A paper describes a structure:
Since posttransfer editing by LeuRS in apicomplexans has not been characterized, we performed binding experiments with the CmLeuRS editing domain and posttransfer editing substrate analogues for norvaline, 2-(l-norvalyl)amino-2-deoxyadenosine (Nva2AA), and isoleucine, 2-(l-isoleucyl)amino-2-deoxyadenosine (Ile2AA), which mimic a mischarged amino acid attached to Ade76. Calorimetric titrations yielded dissociation constants (Kds) of 213 and 215 μM for Nva2AA and Ile2AA, respectively, over the range of affinities observed for bacterial LeuRS, but they were lower than those seen for other editing tRNA synthetases, such as class II threonine-tRNA synthetase (ThrRS). These data, together with the conservation of important active-site residues, suggest that CmLeuRS preserves posttransfer editing activity. The posttransfer editing substrate analogues Nva2AA and Ile2AA can be unambiguously placed at the editing site of CmLeuRS. As was observed for bacterial and fungal LeuRSs, the aliphatic part of the amino acid binds into the hydrophobic pocket formed by residues T292 and V426, while the amino group interacts with the universally conserved aspartic acid (D433); the adenine base is accommodated by residues of the GTG loop (I414, S415, V423, and K418). In our structures, a water molecule is well positioned for promoting hydrolysis (3 to 4 Å to the carbon alpha atom) and is coordinated by a eukaryote-specific lysine (K496). A similarly placed water molecule is important for bacterial LeuRS editing complexes, although this is coordinated by a bacterium-specific aspartic acid (D344 in the Thermus thermophilus LeuRS). This suggests a common editing mechanism via nucleophilic attack of this water on the oxygen carbonyl, consistent with quantum mechanical calculations on LeuRS. The interactions of the catalytic water and K496 at the editing site of CmLeuRS are strikingly similar to the situation in the ThrRS-Ser3AA complex, which suggests that K496 could have a similar role in hydrolysis by eukaryotic LeuRS. Compared to the structure of the CmLeuRS-AN6426-AMP complex, the posttransfer analogues retain 3 to 4 extra water molecules (depending on the monomer chain) and a phosphate (CmLeuRS-Ile2AA complex), which mediate polar interactions between the compounds and protein residues.
Residue numbers in the entry:
A (entry chain A), B (entry chain A): 254 to 315, 330 to 541
The structure:
């Protein structure tokens, strides 16, 4: 049974040289899968799995190609994502496929994505990103250890006001200088949570309130975080009121698909199934 | 690593009542996955797994819908195929998805195919089909026991002149009246193999010649059939000359993609990945 996500495109604002030599002038986005496009107003940072190994996937700019060279000339965009998600994107028309030459002979056509190279999540910690809707001009890639490489793209945007997981993981960074030292996390990469949604019995900073209610102490308390995640998801969909954006004042249930449609129209997001 | 197939659409020429009550006036195709679109000239019958359980999938006539009713009004076509392949088709835009109502609540969107019902392969034995390119006006569904429900659509068209598997399975039908009796196979459903490809050291009926060379005695001789299959595939791609069609006289390697493009343009075939 597949699930529908919104893939959010976070533009790399300054491409580091270790990527620039491989992507050669192309726009590069880190792409994240979310069920909650309506929370983009509250993004504070991006999350990656430090030991996750990600692809640099050639993508269509805002039919299966016969030649690598033609695909390389026609596509000026790269998506950083798990290879797994890249194939799903390719089936869905989001990135090109080519008739691969890497095995067998010409008697069979073997469709393959075009991956320029690999990157470890750790190498991206600290990269500045332009993200949609958030008031921050730049947000930064930080480590999260609970990320599954088997889900979405393996890259996750952070809205700590309204995700218990994001709140716990960011608090882990804020309170452990041995964590910040290990990955050289600068202070200026750690941005304050933003009030974006009112939950009429809880206030405007609901993820923090629920982490306390469930007595969650770290981003590893999986069973507890699972209950918190599920409660905040249902409660906010049916009762949460947006206090930001075009649909400020409206319930999430009434605004969510309009927000999502706008992100898609504006080129910040895509529909993604897996 | 995905493979590229051509899905061949075989139109049901007379829809039996047990299907007609479910599909209600819609065109119905049995859809088959093949690597060899150039052999459509030699189709003699269609194969199904008697105990395979197939879906009746609503399909686009020659974006995810919110309502079942709208999808039902907009789609006048049904594809018989495995559910597994139907999902792959849906990801690739070949059949519609809807936002399902079958579980959970409105706070999540769960894309689902629209399956009108199930059919067992056995119930379809004897159904007359209009198939592309073959000189036969109608060909008929027959049982093949080696079919994998995990591959393609679980439905396979038959070209016994140039598929060792098809030759063995049809010969099993021709020589076992206990097989024909069990499934009530009429004589007039068993059509003669057609000469379609010359292999310059082998002649015009190469699959039969190879089954003898490998001493294959039934459609179950999997290891032997695997070697035969692989030899005929490579040999015919590089050395086989078509004696039928627009590209008669040309080598398969030079004609195959033009034949395939034509089937697609004419609405007889689609590109399918899995
Ligand atoms: C306020 C929500 C904020 C932006 C929140 N941060 C969010 O977008 N969460 C993602 C998604 O909505 C949720 C349920 O599918 O899992 C997260 N997710 C997506 N890919 C993931 C992965 N690879 N590993 C762990 N969680 C993942
Ligand atoms: C002359 C070729 C004639 C039409 C030949 N009959 C052909 O089209 N063969 C299919 C395909 O080309 C081959 C390799 O993928 O497996 C058959 N195939 C496809 N789906 C299958 C399934 N579910 N189970 C077993 N074999 C399958």
């Amino acid at each position: 049974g597949p699930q529908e996500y919104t893939l959010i495109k976070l533009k790399i604002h300054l491409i580091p040289e270790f990527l620039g030599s491989i992507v050669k002038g192309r726009e590069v986005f880190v792409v994240c899968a979310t069920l909650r496009p309506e929370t983009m107003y509250g993004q504070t940072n991006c999350w990656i799995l430090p030991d996750g190994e990600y692809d640099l996937v050639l993508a269509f700019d805002q039919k299966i190609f016969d030649k690598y060279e033609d695909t390389m000339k026609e596509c000026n965009t790269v998506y950083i994502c798990s290879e797994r998600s890249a194939y799903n994107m390719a089936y869905q028309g989001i990135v090109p496929l080519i008739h691969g030459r890497e095995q067998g002979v010409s008697d069979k056509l073997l469709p393959r994505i075009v991956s320029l190279g690999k990157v470890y999540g750790e190498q991206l910690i600290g990269t500045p990103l332009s993200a949609p809707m958030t008031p921050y001009s730049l947000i930064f890639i930080l480590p999260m250890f609970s990320i599954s490489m088997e889900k979405g793209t393996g890259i996750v945007t952070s809205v700590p006001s309204d995700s218990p997981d994001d709140y716990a993981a960011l608090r882990d960074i804020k309170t452990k200088p041995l964590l910040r030292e290990k990955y050289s996390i600068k202070d200026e990469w750690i941005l304050d949570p933003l009030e974006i949604i009112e939950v009429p019995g809880f206030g405007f900073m609901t993820a923090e309130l629920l982490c306390n209610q469930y007595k969650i102490q770290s981003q590893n308390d999986s069973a507890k975080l699972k209950q918190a995640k599920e409660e905040i998801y249902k409660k906010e969909f049916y009762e949460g009121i947006l206090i930001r954006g075009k649909y400020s004042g409206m319930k999430i249930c009434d605004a969510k698909e309009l927000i999502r449609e706008s992100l898609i129209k504006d080129g910040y997001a895509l529909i993604y199934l897996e």
